[PDB]
Amino acid sequence: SHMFIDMENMFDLLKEETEVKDLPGAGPLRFQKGRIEFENVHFSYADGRETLQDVSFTVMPGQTLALVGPSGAGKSTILRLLFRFYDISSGCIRIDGQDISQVTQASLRSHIGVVPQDTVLFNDTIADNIRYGRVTAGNDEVEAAAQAAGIHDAIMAFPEGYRTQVGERGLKLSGGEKQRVAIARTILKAPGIILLDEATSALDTSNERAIQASLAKVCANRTTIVVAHRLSTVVNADQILVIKDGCIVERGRHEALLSRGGVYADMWQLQQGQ
Numbered sequence: 539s540h541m542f543i544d545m546e547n548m549f550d551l552l553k554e555e556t557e558v559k560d561l562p563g564a565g566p567l568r569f570q571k572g573r574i575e576f577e578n579v580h581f582s583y584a585d586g587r588e589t590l591q592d593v594s595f596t597v598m599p600g601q602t603l604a605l606v607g608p609s610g611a612g613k614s615t616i617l618r619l620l621f622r623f624y625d626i627s628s629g630c631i632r633i634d635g636q637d638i639s640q641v642t643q644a645s646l647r648s649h650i651g652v653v654p655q656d657t658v659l660f661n662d663t664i665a666d667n668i669r670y671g672r673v674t675a676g677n678d679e680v681e682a683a684a685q686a687a688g689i690h691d692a693i694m695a696f697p698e699g700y701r702t703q704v705g706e707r708g709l710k711l712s713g714g715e716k717q718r719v720a721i722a723r724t725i726l727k728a729p730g731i732i733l734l735d736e737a738t739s740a741l742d743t744s745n746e747r748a749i750q751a752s753l754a755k756v757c758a759n760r761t762t763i764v765v766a767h768r769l770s771t772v773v774n775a776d777q778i779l780v781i782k783d784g785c786i787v788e789r790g791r792h793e794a795l796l797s798r799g800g801v802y803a804d805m806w807q808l809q810q811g812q
Contacts, residue, residue: 558625558643560699566645570634571599572730572761574620579629581615581784589615591784593629597777604775606802612784613765617733620763622646634732650728653753655737657720661705664693664719673725679726687722688752689715714745721752732757734764736771769809778802 541765550704553733554561574597581590585795589611591642605613618624619631631638636647651671659667668680673681680700684690696702702709711719724732740746750770766772773792780788780795780802788800795802 547780549752558622560642560644561640564640564642565795567633567636567638567641567649569649569730570647572600573632573634573727574603574731574761574763575630575632576616577630577632579619580627581619581624582627588627589784593784593786595777595779595789597761597763598808599761600759601776602764602774603756604764604766604772604778605781606772606783606805610781610783612781614651614735616781617652617735617765618762620731620733621650634788635687635709638743649729650731650733650805651724651727653720653724653732653734655735657716659705659708659711659716659719662703663700664696664702664704664709665700665706667719668722668726671726671729675726680722683725686725687718688748689718689722712750713739717741717749718752721749721756723751724756729796730760732760732762732764734762736765736767738767789793 576593576595579590579593580620581587593612593616595603605616607613615624619626620638622638625639629805633646633649658668665677665680668683669675671683672679677700681690684693684700693700693702696709696720704711734757752773761810764771764775766775772778775792778789778792778795779786782801788795788798788802790798796806797803
């Protein structure tokens with residue numbers, strides 16, 4: 539009775555469901571101020587396998603939103619979806635009012651800077667590693683980005699300055715320097731949206747404070763979603779979402795969630811100690 543199925547049509551429908559492609563005639567995202575909306579977003583990667591369930595939130599332009607909660611794939615799935623690394627199973631994600639699945643992924647990604655937990659360094663010069671943020675940038679901009687991220691002086695001390703080979707087959711950068719490369723990349727991109735996934739490791743007190751300050755500074759005036767581990771990041775966020783098992787179980791600013799006296803407050807009391 540499936541003698542009437544058109545195999546070509548099944549393959550066309552498979553392709554729609556399973557591949558992240560631009561719609562025919564998709565135009566550029568019209569980026570204004572970087573308002574983000576998730577509306578009733580679900581993400582499931584098979585039958586029963588739901589990693590985000592009915593997730594809704596709004597991040598107003600320039601604001602920061604911290605994602606917190608126990609270990610789980612939900613928090614970083616939210617970052618992936620905003621980047622359209624996957625399509626959503628249902629609901630809608632919008633930037634500046636526009637459904638991000640209806641625009642070119644290229645245009646979408648041009649406005650988003652990702653700062654991952656682990657900084658990818660290529661087997662290339664330190665100049666070109668920073669330049670990776672925006673390949674078109676002149677040497678002077680690369681320098682100013684390095685200067686602003688606080689690694690210019692270190693690079694000067696490098697055996698070949700900006701032409702110093704780094705990465706796996708190059709000079710070993712410290713964890714601080716590596717992180718600052720990520721920041722300089724982001725400065726060079728100048729995106730309107732930042733997706734930050736905080737590292738679980740930490741550096742010395744002095745460096746941590748300095749890096750946390752640089753990060754705070756590059757996120758200034760930019761719409762920011764962060765998968766947060768540091769208390770300072772959460773205390774300072776415009777809004778906090780507590781995610782457990784793919785659900786937003788509570789939300790608000792730090793002080794409001796403490797006085798609410800739920801899951802977040804319990805976590806805070808546990809971290810404080812007797």
